[PDB]
Amino acid sequence: KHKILHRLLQDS
Amino acid sequence: KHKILHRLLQDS
Amino acid sequence: SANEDMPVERILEAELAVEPKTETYVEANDPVTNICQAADKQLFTLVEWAKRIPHFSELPLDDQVILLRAGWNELLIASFSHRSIAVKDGILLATGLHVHRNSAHSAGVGAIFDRVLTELVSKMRDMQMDKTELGCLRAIVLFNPDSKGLSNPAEVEALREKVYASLEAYCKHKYPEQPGRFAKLLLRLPALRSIGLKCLEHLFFFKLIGDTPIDTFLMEMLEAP
Amino acid sequence: SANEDMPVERILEAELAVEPKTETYVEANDPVTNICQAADKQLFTLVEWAKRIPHFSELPLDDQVILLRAGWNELLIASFSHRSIAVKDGILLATGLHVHRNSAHSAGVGAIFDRVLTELVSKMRDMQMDKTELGCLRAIVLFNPDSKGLSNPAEVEALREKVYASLEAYCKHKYPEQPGRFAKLLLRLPALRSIGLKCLEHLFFFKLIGDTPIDTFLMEMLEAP
Ligand SMILES: CCCCCCCCCCCCCCCC(=O)O
Ligand SMILES: CCCCCCCCCCCCCCCC(=O)O
Ligand SMILES: [Cl-]
Ligand SMILES: [Cl-]
Structure with a gap:
């Protein structure tokens, strides 16, 4: 899952 | 307390 | 040589980039609620910190996720602990609140x-x-190569080794009169691990009892893999 | 200089003095019962080991007690782990029994x-x-200077520093081609701490459920201070 963490890691 | 540990540490 | 592939200048820049701007602290109903609010806030900042550590952003996304889920609690504890060297009987939260020893004991987390x-x-x-x-x-x-599920634990091990080679060189150059300093730094990591485990046990209890607000990112970190 | 007040020769002699004499291992009802019997046996041997470590016996008796109560579980885990490098999917107990991965999983401790x-x-x-x-x-x-209740934590810190100064010198002399080796050794200690905490949680559960024999010395180590 880890929705928030994936979103924050993507955003460059 | 620690009866066994005290006994084993004393014995020289 | 150490410094070039993992420069301590870039690791310091990562620390300085994410420092909170608190002019004057004030004492925190429940300090545990304030600590949990600060932890949620600082998880967002932790992701920004990690992106600034050399080579972290070059790992596979799934491995970035595993390392931050494995490390966040120790990473946050190390940060607020170092921030708190400035006060005598308390901790300084990133929200600009102080939690006194006495407040923590009075909340059942002494x-x-x-x-x-x-x-x-x-x-x-x-x-x-x-x-x-x-x-x-x-x-x-x-860079914890023991984290379960990593796609390439050997590459994380190699990054860890580059950090500790760079740290040792830094310590020998800056503190040559303290030959034990590098070991003394590393030997805080077992205490950090133990304290992180106990803090996580508390947080799971706070979630279970349901009497402590836990915001969305902190809640996500408490979810099963 | 390091070596003289804390000689690695004496620390090796302590290890070699307490090694079990097992010619041929055999596979262990309940491997957890065999592991607990081996732990009880090895607590007696641990006290003999600690007496052979330079300066330990010169500490106050109450501080010797605190250090062994704080450390025993990690000390025993480090020993059986190192003993087990000889086998591929198991651990070698001091009693001459092997516990296979499959046996451990089949006992609910996988x-x-x-x-x-x-x-x-x-x-x-x-x-x-x-x-x-x-x-x-x-x-x-x-020599864990964070152990609660020590009469003189600074003297235990100083003994720890003498060991790690001696270990670093030993590593530089014997393994000069591996400049990272000393750090790599120290960086197993957080994993050891975490695994020790989880093993102690298991042992407290085994005691609570009451379905696993726990002999007198192991039982004494599970008593409150
Ligand atoms: C510090 C005492 C712990 C009290 C109860 C356990 C809760 C665990 C919280 C640990 C993470 C705290 C993060 C603070 C973030 C910060 O302000 O820098
Ligand atoms: C190894 C898996 C642990 C299973 C359940 C937890 C029990 C904790 C026991 C840890 C101490 C074991 C000591 C063995 C002594 C030895 O033979 O050298
Ligand atoms: Cl230390
Ligand atoms: Cl490591």
Whole structure:
């Protein structure tokens, strides 16, 4: 899952 | 307390 | 040679980039609620910190996720502990709140609070641990090759080794009169691990009892894999 | 200089003095019962080991007690882990019994058993950790200045520093081609701490449920201070 963490890691 | 540990540490 | 593939300058820059701007602290109903609000806030900042550590952003996304889920609690504890060397019987939260020893004891979390002060804050203060050293210890924690599920544990091990080679060189150059300093830094990591485990046990209890607000990112970190 | 007040020769002699004499291992109803019987046996041997570590016997008796009560579980885990580098999917107990991965999983302790194999045994094997290095890591664990209630934590800190100064010198002399080796040894201590905490949680559960025999010395170590 880890929705928030994936979103924050993507955003460059 | 620690009866066994005290006994084993004393014995020289 | 150490410094070039993992430069301590970049690790210090990561620390300095994410420092909170608090002019004057004030004492925190429940300090545990304030600590949990600060932890949620600082998880967002932790992701920004990790992106600034050399090579972290080049790992596979799934491995970035595993390392931050494995490390966040120790990473946050190391940060607030180092921030707190400035006060005598308390911790400084990133929200600009202070939690006094007495407040923590009065909230039923005295024992873990005392471990943080005695094993981390006081020891960081006693040796004047600097921000480069803190950053390097945090980067060692982040690059944890024992984290379960990594696609390539050997590449994380290699990044950890580059950090500790760079930290040792930094310590020998800056503190040549203290040949034991590098070992002394590393030997705070078992205490950090133990304190992190106990803090996570508390947080799971706070979630279970349901009497402590837990915001969305902190809640996500408490979810099963 | 390091070596003279805390000689690695004496730490190796302590290791070699207490090694079990097992010619041929055999597979262990309940492997957990066999592990608990071996732990009780090895607590007696641990006291003899600690007496042979330079300066330990010169500490106040109450501080000797605090250090062994704080450290025993990590000390025993480090020992059986290093003993087990000789086998591929198991651990070798001091009683001459082997516990296979499959036996541990079949007894409901698979997850912790796998952590021991992956984070300790395999890593000790991969780097060919030697008995001098093992002995020094164990002496660092024994001399834990964070142990609560010590009469003079600074003297225990000083003994720890003498061990790690001696270990570093030993590593530089014997393994000069591996400049990272000393750090790599120290960086097993957080995993050892975590695995020790989880093993102690298991042992408290085994005591609570009451379905696992726990002999007198192991029982005494599970008593409140
Ligand atoms: C410090 C005592 C712990 C009290 C109860 C356990 C809760 C665990 C929280 C640990 C993470 C805290 C993060 C603070 C973030 C910060 O302000 O820098
Ligand atoms: C190894 C998996 C653990 C299974 C359940 C937890 C029990 C904790 C026991 C840890 C101490 C074991 C000591 C063995 C002594 C030895 O033979 O050298
Ligand atoms: Cl230490
Ligand atoms: Cl490591």
